[PDB]
Amino acid sequence: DDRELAILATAENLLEDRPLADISVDDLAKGAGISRPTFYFYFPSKEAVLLTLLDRVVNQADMALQTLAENPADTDRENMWRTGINVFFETFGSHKAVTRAGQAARATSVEVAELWSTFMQKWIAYTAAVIDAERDRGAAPRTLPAHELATALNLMNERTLFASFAGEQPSVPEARVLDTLVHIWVTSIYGE
Amino acid sequence: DDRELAILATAENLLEDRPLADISVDDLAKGAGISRPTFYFYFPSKEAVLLTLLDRVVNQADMALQTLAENPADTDRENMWRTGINVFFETFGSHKAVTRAGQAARATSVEVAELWSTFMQKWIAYTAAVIDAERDRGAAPRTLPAHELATALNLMNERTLFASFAGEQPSVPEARVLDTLVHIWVTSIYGE
Ligand SMILES: C[C@@H]1C[C@H]1c1ccc(CCC(=O)N2CCC(C(N)=O)CC2)o1
Ligand SMILES: C[C@@H]1C[C@H]1c1ccc(CCC(=O)N2CCC(C(N)=O)CC2)o1
C-alpha cells in the first residue's frame, strides 16, 4: 500500500503539469521509487491509476454530501443549497488536475464514463428528492418535473465548475462561481 | 468544390456511425470517389475535415441568432428566450454527429477549442447585453453580474444539449430540454 500510495501521489503531482497522454508508466514508476514491472503489479495501466484517483475524489465528495444530509445546517434555504454545492466546489477544487483529467478520460474510457454516470445519477436523485420535499412542504412551487430540473442544474454545475477550475475562456471566475450557481439553483427551484 | 462537398458529406455520414478515431483518410477518399493524394489536396488531415464541418454548423447557428436579433418575435419575454435557445437546439440537433465529435475534439485540437471559445464568448456577450437591456427597462432585477449569469446559463445549455443529443445517462430527454432550459433562464434572469 505504501508503494501504491506513492504511485497515486506521483500521478496526481504529474497531472498538475501534463495530461495523461504525456505521462508514461516509466514516469510513474520513477516518481514512486519502483521499477516498471513492479508498477504493473499494482496497476495494469496508467488509465487504472487515473481511475483510482478519480474514484477516491468522487467518493470523498459523495461521503461529504452524505455527512451534510445527516447533519443539516440550521440555516435558511439559500445557505442550505450553497452548503451542498460547496461540497463539490471544495472537493473537486482541491483536486483540479485529477478532476480535469478524469473528465477528459470520459471520452476514451468506459469505466471512467461509468463512474461519473453512477455518481451523477445519485446526486441528481438526491437533488430531485430535496426539491420534492420542498414542494411537499409548500416552500417551492410545482413547476418543472423535479428530476428534469435537477438534471439540468447538476449538469450546469459540472460544466461551470470544470470551466472555472480550468480557467477556460469563457468561464465564471473561481471566486464568483459559488454565488453564481446558488443564484440560479435558488431562483429556478423556488421561482413561480 | 463539388469534391470538397463530397468529402464533407462523407465525413458527416461516417461520423454518424463511428468516432473520428475510427475513420481514416482512406474511408473519406473512398466515400467522396477520389484518391488519397487527391484528398490531401483539399484538406491536410481528417481533423481539418471536422474543423470545417464544425465551422459551418457554428456559423449557421450564429447567423440564425443574428437573424432573430434583427427580426424580434412579437411575443412575451418567455417566448423571446425560448426562440433564441431553440436556434441552438434545432441547429446543433440537426447535426448531432458533427456536434458531438466537435466537442470531443476540443480536448485534442487547438483550433477546435478556439472556434468554440470564440463563438461562446460572442453568444455570452449577446446574452449579457439582453439581460442588461431588460434591467435598464425595469423588467429584470439587478441581481448577479449580467455577464457571469450569462456565462453560467450558456454553459448549462452547452452541457445539457450535448448530453441530451448523445443520450448520456444522466440527461434530460430531448423532448423536454427546451422547456427545462427556458424555465431556468427565465427564473434566474427575472427572479428577485
Ligand atoms: C465537478 C463535479 C461534477 C460536478 C458536480 C456534480 C454535482 C455538482 C454540484 C451539485 C450537487 O450535486 N448537489 C448540490 C447540493 C444539493 C444538496 N442539497 O446537498 C444536492 C447535491 O457538481
Ligand atoms: C450546443 C451549443 C454549444 C451550445 C450552446 C451555446 C449557446 C447555447 C444556447 C444559448 C444562446 O447562446 N442564446 C440563447 C438565446 C438568447 C437570445 N435572446 O437570442 C441568447 C443566445 O447552446
Annotate A116-181 with three-state secondary structure: HHHHHHHHHHHHHHHHHHHHHCCCCCCCCCHHHHHHHHHHHHHHHHHHHHHCCCCCCCHHHHHHHH
Question: Which approach determined this entry?
Answer: X-ray
Match 463530397 to its residue by C-alpha cell.
Answer: B6
Taking CA A183 as the corner, what is the angle to CA A181 and CA A188, rounded to the nearest 5 degrees? Answer: 100
Q: Which residues of A touch B179 (CB under 8 A)?
A: 144
Q: Which residues of B touch A172 (CB under 8 A)?
A: 148, 151-152
Please name the member of B121, B148, B181 whose beta carbon is closest to the beta carbon of A152. B181
Exposure string of A79-103, with b = 16+ CB inside 10 Å and e = fewer, is ebbbebbbbbbebbbebbbbbbbbb
Return the number of other C-beta atoms located less than 10 Å from residue A157's C-beta. 24
Ligand 2: atom nearest CA of B103 is: 3
The chain B residue lying nearest A147, using CA atoms, is B172
Domains in chain A and their CATH numbers?
A: 1-45 (1.10.10.60), 46-192 (1.10.357.10)
User: Is residue A105 within 8 Å of residue A112, measured between CB atoms?
Assistant: yes
Cα within 13 Å of Cα(B79), Cβ side? 5
Q: Looking at ligand 2, which residue's alpha carbon is closest to its atom 7?
A: B154
- Distance in angstroms (rounded) separating the CA atoms of residues B65 and B154: 14
- Distance in angstroms (rounded) separating the CA atoms of residues B160 and A153: 9
- Distance in angstroms (rounded) separating the CA atoms of residues B41 and B25: 12
Give the DSSP H/E element, type plus range, for residue A29: helix A25-32
What is residue B106's DSSP assignment? T
- Distance in angstroms (rounded) separating the CA atoms of residues A14 and A20: 9
Q: What's the length of chain A?
A: 192
Candidates A91, B184, B21, B128; CA nearest to A102 is A91
Candidates A165, A53, A174, A24; CA nearest to A111 is A53
- Distance in angstroms (rounded) separating the CA atoms of residues B114 and A76: 42
Candidates B153, B183, B164; CA nearest to B82 is B183
Rg (CA), chain A: 19
- Distance in angstroms (rounded) separating the CA atoms of residues A99 and A126: 22
- Distance in angstroms (rounded) separating the CA atoms of residues B156 and B12: 26
Q: Which residues of B touch A159 (CB under 8 A)?
A: 155-156, 158-159
Resolution to 1 decimal, in Å? 2.0
Quickly list H helices, chain B.
2-15, 25-32, 36-42, 46-70, 77-93, 96-104, 110-136, 146-166, 177-190
Give the DSSP H/E element, type plus range, for residue A77: helix A77-93
Q: What is the largest CA-CA distance in chain A?
A: 62
Question: Mutate which of A76, A88, A120, A149 to test ligand 1's pocket (most atoms within 8 Å of Cβ)?
Answer: A88
The chain B residue lying nearest A119, using CA atoms, is B170
User: Is residue B170 within 8 Å of residue A124, measured between CB atoms?
Assistant: yes
Taking CA A165 as the corner, what is the angle to CA A161 and CA A170, rounded to the nearest 5 degrees? Answer: 80
B3's grid cell? 469534391
Q: Are A144 and B191 within 8 A, CB to CB?
A: no
- Residue B188: alpha-carbon gap to chain centroid: 22
